[PDB]
Short mmCIF file of C-alpha atoms (C1' of nucleotides) and ligand atoms in Angstrom, two decimals:
data_model
loop_
_atom_site.label_atom_id
_atom_site.label_comp_id
_atom_site.label_asym_id
_atom_site.label_seq_id
_atom_site.Cartn_x
_atom_site.Cartn_y
_atom_site.Cartn_z
CA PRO A 7 -13.77 -7.28 -23.73
CA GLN A 8 -11.89 -5.72 -26.53
CA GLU A 9 -13.74 -2.57 -27.84
CA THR A 10 -13.06 -4.10 -31.30
CA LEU A 11 -15.72 -6.58 -30.54
CA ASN A 12 -19.39 -4.63 -30.30
CA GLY A 13 -17.80 -1.29 -30.03
CA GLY A 14 -19.41 0.24 -33.19
CA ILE A 15 -22.73 -0.95 -31.70
CA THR A 16 -21.94 0.65 -28.30
CA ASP A 17 -20.44 3.68 -29.93
CA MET A 18 -23.65 3.86 -32.19
CA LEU A 19 -26.10 3.19 -28.93
CA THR A 20 -24.21 6.01 -26.72
CA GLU A 21 -24.44 8.87 -29.38
CA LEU A 22 -28.15 8.13 -29.80
CA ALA A 23 -28.51 8.42 -26.12
CA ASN A 24 -26.59 11.79 -26.14
CA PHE A 25 -28.85 12.97 -28.63
CA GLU A 26 -32.08 11.74 -27.02
CA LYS A 27 -30.85 13.65 -23.77
CA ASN A 28 -29.50 17.05 -25.26
CA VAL A 29 -31.83 17.23 -28.06
CA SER A 30 -34.92 15.34 -27.68
CA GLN A 31 -35.06 16.17 -23.84
CA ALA A 32 -35.94 12.31 -23.36
CA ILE A 33 -33.95 11.56 -20.33
CA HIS A 34 -35.59 8.12 -20.07
CA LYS A 35 -34.67 7.05 -23.66
CA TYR A 36 -31.29 8.57 -22.61
CA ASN A 37 -30.98 6.00 -19.79
CA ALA A 38 -32.37 3.19 -22.22
CA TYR A 39 -29.66 3.32 -24.80
CA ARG A 40 -27.20 3.75 -22.22
CA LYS A 41 -28.19 0.82 -20.55
CA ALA A 42 -28.47 -1.22 -23.79
CA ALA A 43 -24.73 0.41 -24.21
CA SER A 44 -23.43 -1.20 -20.92
CA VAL A 45 -24.72 -4.72 -21.44
CA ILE A 46 -23.45 -4.96 -25.07
CA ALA A 47 -20.13 -3.70 -24.07
CA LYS A 48 -19.75 -6.10 -21.22
CA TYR A 49 -20.85 -9.00 -23.38
CA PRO A 50 -17.89 -11.59 -24.54
CA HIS A 51 -18.84 -12.21 -27.70
CA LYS A 52 -19.15 -10.42 -31.13
CA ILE A 53 -22.96 -10.07 -31.55
CA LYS A 54 -23.86 -11.81 -35.20
CA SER A 55 -27.40 -10.50 -35.01
CA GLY A 56 -30.22 -8.20 -33.49
CA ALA A 57 -32.11 -11.33 -32.27
CA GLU A 58 -28.80 -12.37 -30.29
CA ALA A 59 -28.59 -8.72 -28.47
CA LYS A 60 -32.21 -8.66 -27.70
CA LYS A 61 -31.73 -11.45 -25.41
CA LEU A 62 -29.73 -9.18 -23.01
CA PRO A 63 -31.52 -7.32 -20.68
CA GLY A 64 -32.25 -3.49 -21.77
CA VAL A 65 -31.95 -4.50 -25.49
CA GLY A 66 -35.47 -4.55 -26.98
CA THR A 67 -36.97 -4.72 -30.37
CA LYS A 68 -36.09 -1.28 -31.88
CA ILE A 69 -32.56 -1.67 -30.74
CA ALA A 70 -32.21 -4.95 -32.42
CA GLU A 71 -33.24 -3.58 -35.12
CA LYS A 72 -30.94 -0.66 -35.22
CA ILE A 73 -27.99 -3.51 -35.03
CA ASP A 74 -29.19 -5.29 -37.71
CA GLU A 75 -28.98 -2.21 -39.96
CA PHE A 76 -25.44 -1.13 -38.41
CA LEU A 77 -24.67 -4.87 -39.10
CA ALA A 78 -25.37 -5.03 -42.43
CA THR A 79 -24.27 -1.57 -43.57
CA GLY A 80 -21.81 -0.32 -41.00
CA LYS A 81 -23.72 2.49 -40.28
CA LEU A 82 -27.08 3.92 -39.11
CA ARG A 83 -29.15 6.31 -41.13
CA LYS A 84 -30.80 8.12 -38.64
CA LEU A 85 -27.53 8.73 -36.97
CA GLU A 86 -25.80 9.80 -40.08
CA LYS A 87 -28.58 12.43 -40.61
CA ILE A 88 -28.82 14.13 -37.18
CA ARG A 89 -24.98 14.07 -36.99
CA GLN A 90 -25.39 16.05 -39.87
CA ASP A 91 -27.85 18.62 -38.66
CA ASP A 92 -26.53 22.01 -37.98
CA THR A 93 -28.83 22.87 -35.35
CA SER A 94 -28.89 19.11 -33.54
CA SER A 95 -25.19 18.78 -33.61
CA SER A 96 -24.98 22.45 -32.20
CA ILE A 97 -27.24 21.79 -29.45
CA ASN A 98 -25.73 18.48 -28.60
CA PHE A 99 -22.22 19.90 -28.61
CA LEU A 100 -23.03 22.99 -26.30
CA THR A 101 -24.45 20.53 -23.44
CA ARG A 102 -20.44 19.69 -23.24
CA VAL A 103 -20.15 23.23 -21.39
CA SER A 104 -20.89 22.63 -17.87
CA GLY A 105 -23.99 24.38 -16.72
CA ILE A 106 -25.53 24.72 -20.27
CA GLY A 107 -28.05 21.69 -20.27
CA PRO A 108 -30.60 20.65 -22.83
CA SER A 109 -32.79 23.91 -22.42
CA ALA A 110 -30.06 26.23 -22.13
CA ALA A 111 -28.50 24.59 -25.14
CA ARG A 112 -31.73 24.84 -27.10
CA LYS A 113 -32.37 28.61 -26.18
CA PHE A 114 -28.45 29.32 -27.70
CA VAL A 115 -28.92 27.50 -30.43
CA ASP A 116 -32.26 29.22 -31.38
CA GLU A 117 -30.67 32.69 -31.22
CA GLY A 118 -28.12 31.97 -33.23
CA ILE A 119 -25.28 30.88 -30.75
CA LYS A 120 -23.82 27.88 -31.80
CA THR A 121 -20.17 27.35 -30.83
CA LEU A 122 -17.65 27.85 -28.17
CA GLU A 123 -16.75 31.30 -29.97
CA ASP A 124 -20.18 32.03 -30.30
CA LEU A 125 -20.66 31.51 -26.07
CA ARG A 126 -17.15 33.74 -25.61
CA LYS A 127 -18.87 36.34 -27.81
CA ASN A 128 -22.04 36.41 -25.59
CA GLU A 129 -20.89 36.31 -21.82
CA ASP A 130 -23.84 38.66 -20.49
CA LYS A 131 -26.04 35.83 -21.49
CA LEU A 132 -24.43 33.00 -19.25
CA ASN A 133 -24.92 32.51 -15.74
CA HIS A 134 -21.83 31.94 -13.34
CA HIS A 135 -21.80 28.30 -13.61
CA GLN A 136 -21.70 28.42 -17.31
CA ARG A 137 -19.02 30.98 -17.71
CA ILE A 138 -17.11 28.94 -15.46
CA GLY A 139 -17.78 25.80 -17.63
CA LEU A 140 -16.89 27.69 -21.08
CA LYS A 141 -13.70 29.04 -19.45
CA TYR A 142 -12.63 25.38 -17.96
CA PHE A 143 -14.08 23.54 -20.88
CA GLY A 144 -11.04 21.61 -21.98
CA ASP A 145 -10.04 20.95 -18.57
CA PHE A 146 -13.18 19.57 -17.51
CA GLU A 147 -13.03 16.87 -20.10
CA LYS A 148 -9.73 15.56 -19.18
CA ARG A 149 -9.27 12.69 -16.68
CA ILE A 150 -7.45 12.79 -13.26
CA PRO A 151 -4.67 10.50 -12.74
CA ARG A 152 -4.70 8.64 -9.69
CA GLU A 153 -1.06 10.25 -8.44
CA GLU A 154 -2.67 13.75 -8.94
CA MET A 155 -5.97 12.64 -7.21
CA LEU A 156 -3.26 11.14 -4.29
CA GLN A 157 -1.77 14.54 -4.08
CA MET A 158 -5.28 16.48 -4.28
CA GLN A 159 -6.48 14.32 -1.09
CA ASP A 160 -3.34 15.42 0.52
CA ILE A 161 -4.21 18.89 0.51
CA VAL A 162 -8.12 18.24 1.07
CA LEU A 163 -7.39 16.12 4.29
CA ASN A 164 -4.33 18.41 5.61
CA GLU A 165 -6.50 21.70 5.10
CA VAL A 166 -9.76 19.98 6.62
CA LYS A 167 -7.63 19.16 9.82
CA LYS A 168 -6.29 22.48 10.10
CA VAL A 169 -9.64 23.77 10.34
CA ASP A 170 -10.43 21.44 13.13
CA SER A 171 -8.91 18.17 13.82
CA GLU A 172 -12.44 16.74 14.86
CA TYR A 173 -13.53 16.87 11.37
CA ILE A 174 -13.60 13.48 9.16
CA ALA A 175 -13.45 13.93 5.75
CA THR A 176 -13.59 10.65 2.86
CA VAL A 177 -12.87 11.14 -0.84
CA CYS A 178 -15.07 8.72 -2.32
CA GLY A 179 -16.39 7.78 -5.94
CA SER A 180 -13.98 5.34 -7.73
CA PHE A 181 -10.98 7.05 -6.60
CA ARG A 182 -11.74 5.44 -3.42
CA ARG A 183 -12.32 1.63 -5.27
CA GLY A 184 -8.88 2.24 -6.22
CA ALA A 185 -9.12 3.48 -9.62
CA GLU A 186 -6.47 4.50 -12.11
CA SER A 187 -8.04 7.60 -13.04
CA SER A 188 -10.81 9.85 -11.73
CA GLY A 189 -13.25 12.43 -13.47
CA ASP A 190 -13.83 14.76 -10.59
CA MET A 191 -12.99 14.86 -6.76
CA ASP A 192 -16.25 13.99 -4.49
CA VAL A 193 -15.43 14.75 -0.66
CA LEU A 194 -17.80 13.61 1.93
CA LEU A 195 -17.31 15.73 5.01
CA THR A 196 -18.71 15.45 8.67
CA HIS A 197 -18.10 16.69 12.22
CA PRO A 198 -19.03 15.12 15.38
CA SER A 199 -20.87 18.65 16.31
CA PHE A 200 -23.81 17.94 13.06
CA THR A 201 -26.12 15.35 13.70
CA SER A 202 -29.89 14.76 12.42
CA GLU A 203 -31.14 15.94 15.54
CA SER A 204 -29.14 18.67 16.02
CA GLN A 207 -22.78 25.05 13.26
CA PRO A 208 -24.14 26.01 9.50
CA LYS A 209 -20.74 27.25 8.77
CA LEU A 210 -18.93 24.01 9.27
CA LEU A 211 -18.97 23.61 5.31
CA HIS A 212 -18.00 27.25 4.84
CA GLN A 213 -15.00 27.05 6.96
CA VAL A 214 -13.08 23.94 5.33
CA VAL A 215 -14.29 26.03 1.61
CA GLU A 216 -12.98 29.09 3.05
CA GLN A 217 -9.56 27.32 4.11
CA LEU A 218 -9.23 25.75 0.71
CA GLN A 219 -9.33 28.89 -1.02
CA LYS A 220 -7.12 30.64 1.53
CA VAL A 221 -4.09 27.98 0.36
CA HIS A 222 -5.27 28.61 -3.36
CA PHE A 223 -6.50 25.06 -3.80
CA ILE A 224 -10.25 25.91 -4.49
CA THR A 225 -10.32 28.26 -7.60
CA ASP A 226 -14.09 29.11 -8.23
CA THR A 227 -17.25 28.16 -6.93
CA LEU A 228 -20.33 26.43 -8.89
CA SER A 229 -22.40 26.65 -6.14
CA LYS A 230 -22.22 26.59 -2.35
CA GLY A 231 -24.98 26.52 0.57
CA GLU A 232 -24.71 25.13 3.84
CA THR A 233 -24.79 21.34 3.08
CA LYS A 234 -23.28 21.34 -0.57
CA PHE A 235 -20.29 22.87 -2.68
CA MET A 236 -19.51 22.13 -6.14
CA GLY A 237 -16.56 24.02 -7.31
CA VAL A 238 -13.13 24.08 -9.05
CA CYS A 239 -9.66 23.02 -7.61
CA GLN A 240 -6.08 23.28 -9.30
CA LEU A 241 -2.85 21.67 -7.57
CA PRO A 242 -0.25 23.95 -7.05
CA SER A 243 2.66 23.76 -9.82
CA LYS A 244 5.91 22.37 -9.64
CA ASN A 245 8.49 25.07 -10.27
CA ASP A 246 8.99 25.64 -13.98
CA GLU A 247 6.76 22.86 -15.05
CA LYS A 248 3.41 23.18 -16.69
CA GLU A 249 0.50 23.95 -14.57
CA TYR A 250 -1.90 21.48 -13.87
CA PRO A 251 -5.53 21.30 -15.66
CA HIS A 252 -8.38 22.81 -13.06
CA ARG A 253 -10.47 20.17 -11.75
CA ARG A 254 -14.28 19.79 -10.42
CA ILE A 255 -14.61 19.07 -6.70
CA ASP A 256 -17.45 18.66 -4.85
CA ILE A 257 -17.49 18.97 -1.22
CA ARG A 258 -20.95 17.89 0.96
CA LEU A 259 -21.23 18.05 4.54
CA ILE A 260 -23.30 15.22 6.03
CA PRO A 261 -24.70 14.57 9.57
CA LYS A 262 -22.29 12.09 11.53
CA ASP A 263 -25.49 9.55 12.08
CA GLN A 264 -25.65 9.41 8.09
CA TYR A 265 -22.19 9.53 7.25
CA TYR A 266 -21.18 5.96 6.47
CA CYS A 267 -24.40 4.94 4.40
CA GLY A 268 -23.44 8.27 2.66
CA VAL A 269 -19.96 7.15 2.32
CA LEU A 270 -21.33 3.93 0.92
CA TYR A 271 -23.46 5.37 -1.57
CA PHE A 272 -21.12 7.93 -3.23
CA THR A 273 -18.58 5.20 -3.08
CA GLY A 274 -20.46 3.18 -5.91
CA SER A 275 -20.04 1.67 -8.13
CA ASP A 276 -23.98 2.27 -9.21
CA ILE A 277 -24.25 -1.57 -10.03
CA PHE A 278 -22.65 -2.40 -6.75
CA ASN A 279 -25.08 -0.22 -5.25
CA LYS A 280 -28.24 -1.73 -6.54
CA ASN A 281 -26.83 -5.40 -6.23
CA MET A 282 -26.20 -4.00 -2.43
CA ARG A 283 -29.76 -2.39 -2.51
CA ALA A 284 -31.42 -5.55 -3.69
CA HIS A 285 -30.11 -7.91 -1.20
CA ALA A 286 -31.07 -6.04 0.64
CA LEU A 287 -34.95 -5.82 0.89
CA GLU A 288 -35.09 -9.29 1.03
CA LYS A 289 -33.44 -9.30 4.46
CA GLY A 290 -35.89 -6.56 5.46
CA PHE A 291 -34.14 -3.64 5.19
CA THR A 292 -34.43 -0.40 2.95
CA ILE A 293 -31.36 1.39 2.30
CA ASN A 294 -30.94 4.62 0.65
CA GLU A 295 -28.10 7.43 0.63
CA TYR A 296 -28.98 8.69 3.96
CA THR A 297 -30.17 5.62 6.27
CA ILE A 298 -30.89 1.93 6.42
CA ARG A 299 -34.20 1.37 7.96
CA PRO A 300 -36.13 -2.22 8.72
CA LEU A 301 -39.42 -3.24 7.21
CA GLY A 302 -42.12 -3.58 8.60
CA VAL A 303 -44.45 -6.52 8.31
CA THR A 304 -46.65 -4.70 6.09
CA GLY A 305 -43.95 -2.58 4.61
CA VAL A 306 -43.87 0.24 7.00
CA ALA A 307 -40.40 1.61 7.59
CA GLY A 308 -39.34 2.12 11.07
CA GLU A 309 -36.65 4.82 12.19
CA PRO A 310 -32.89 4.54 10.72
CA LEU A 311 -30.53 1.81 12.64
CA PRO A 312 -27.64 3.41 14.16
CA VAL A 313 -24.71 3.17 11.82
CA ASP A 314 -21.09 3.96 12.88
CA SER A 315 -19.15 2.30 10.06
CA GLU A 316 -19.46 0.77 6.48
CA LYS A 317 -19.43 -2.64 8.23
CA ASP A 318 -22.36 -1.71 10.53
CA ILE A 319 -24.39 -2.06 7.34
CA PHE A 320 -23.05 -5.37 5.79
CA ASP A 321 -23.57 -6.51 9.14
CA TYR A 322 -27.01 -5.49 9.56
CA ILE A 323 -27.94 -6.96 6.16
CA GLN A 324 -25.55 -10.37 6.83
CA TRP A 325 -23.12 -9.59 4.42
CA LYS A 326 -19.16 -9.83 4.76
CA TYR A 327 -17.71 -6.54 4.48
CA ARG A 328 -16.40 -5.78 1.05
CA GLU A 329 -13.17 -3.78 0.31
CA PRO A 330 -13.69 -0.29 -1.93
CA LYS A 331 -11.26 -2.10 -4.44
CA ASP A 332 -14.02 -4.99 -4.43
CA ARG A 333 -17.35 -3.40 -5.32
CA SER A 334 -17.04 -2.96 -9.15
CA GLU A 335 -20.69 -5.27 -8.78
"C1'" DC B 1 -51.66 -0.62 -22.44
"C1'" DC B 2 -49.70 2.45 -20.16
"C1'" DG B 3 -46.49 4.02 -16.27
"C1'" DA B 4 -41.87 3.76 -13.69
"C1'" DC B 5 -37.45 4.86 -15.03
"C1'" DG B 6 -33.49 8.23 -8.39
"C1'" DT B 7 -33.34 11.70 -5.98
"C1'" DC B 8 -32.28 16.40 -4.28
"C1'" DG B 9 -29.17 21.03 -3.09
"C1'" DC B 10 -28.38 25.14 -5.01
"C1'" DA B 11 -29.01 28.92 -8.71
"C1'" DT B 12 -32.18 30.97 -11.44
"C1'" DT B 13 -36.90 32.47 -12.07
"C1'" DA B 14 -42.13 32.71 -12.80
"C1'" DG B 15 -45.90 34.19 -10.40
"C1'" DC B 16 -47.96 36.36 -6.78
"C1'" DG C 1 -40.57 40.82 -0.94
"C1'" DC C 2 -41.76 35.67 -0.86
"C1'" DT C 3 -42.48 31.22 -2.49
"C1'" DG C 4 -43.05 27.19 -5.73
"C1'" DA C 5 -40.82 25.44 -10.43
"C1'" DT C 6 -37.41 24.25 -12.94
"C1'" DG C 7 -33.03 23.49 -14.81
"C1'" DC C 8 -28.62 21.55 -14.25
"C1'" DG C 9 -25.30 18.31 -12.10
"C1'" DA C 10 -24.30 14.49 -9.56
"C1'" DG D 1 -37.09 2.65 -25.63
"C1'" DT D 2 -37.15 -1.13 -22.56
"C1'" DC D 3 -39.66 -3.31 -18.84
"C1'" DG D 4 -43.56 -5.36 -16.16
"C1'" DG D 5 -47.94 -4.57 -13.76
NA1 LIG E 1 -33.65 -7.81 -24.08
NA1 LIG E 2 -23.57 20.60 -19.70
#
DNA sequence: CCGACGTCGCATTAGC
DNA sequence: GCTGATGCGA
DNA sequence: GTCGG
């Protein structure tokens, strides 16, 4: 639906969501407002009243009241106020820095540190992740066009294969669903030598190679199974350099790989629909496994999974292309 | 009325 | 020194 | 904040 239809309302709800998460440290209210913003965003009618909106799942009495106020006045008093508030707006802003959550933001603003400049002045009070977040503040908020994602995938698949041709690497996220743009790159990695029942340098060797060819530029965190860092496409001659990008790489046991690929391919909406289907067939599906219930409700062991289709087939669904998994 | 609301790897840190 | 809790991000 | 046991 066009933004013009209820964009004022959904923008209002998103802003409220952010203040709950970043200022009030109320994560569940944050997700309440987001859920309401999503369902309203998909509503194919211009909302005429709070009562109309309340019919939608996730919109309750209080959001109905806010919509009435917005419709009758074009603003929300509480939002106008908190927007104007020096401390609250500063706390909310600082959390746009990767690594600065509500708690770090609150602590910075308590001691007078309110802007990117104040951060730039006080690097010794920032941890490693936060420094990297500050360094790439602008780049990290840019989207990644699919053409660059393809170029990024090219490098990743190539370098992974150069390390060991028996690795299996899959770039997931909305990119795998064919999205025209991405927020970051999510790479799922496995290897036949790594199972649930079985080196812990499988991940390190791949990260090391990607650093060696100067694709990976910085590290946010890194252990034996999850890497989170920064990358950059090489610059095309006398052209402007590419933005730095967020890349995650996780190593998953072979027997849990395709469950992982399914899960991180999404979308979130499609995943829950599929998780519902789902139990009904007497199966529990999470990021790692699919398991049978269970006349009482006792999960049996993980069923063997050798492809995404294998999962679909357990729950008697026909395989669905990543492009067809928006819901 | 009142609890659930996703879960967990890694980095940092609090307490012993 | 170690272990557990918390913050953070996805 | 919303839902539902
Ligand atoms: Na409702
Ligand atoms: Na942040």
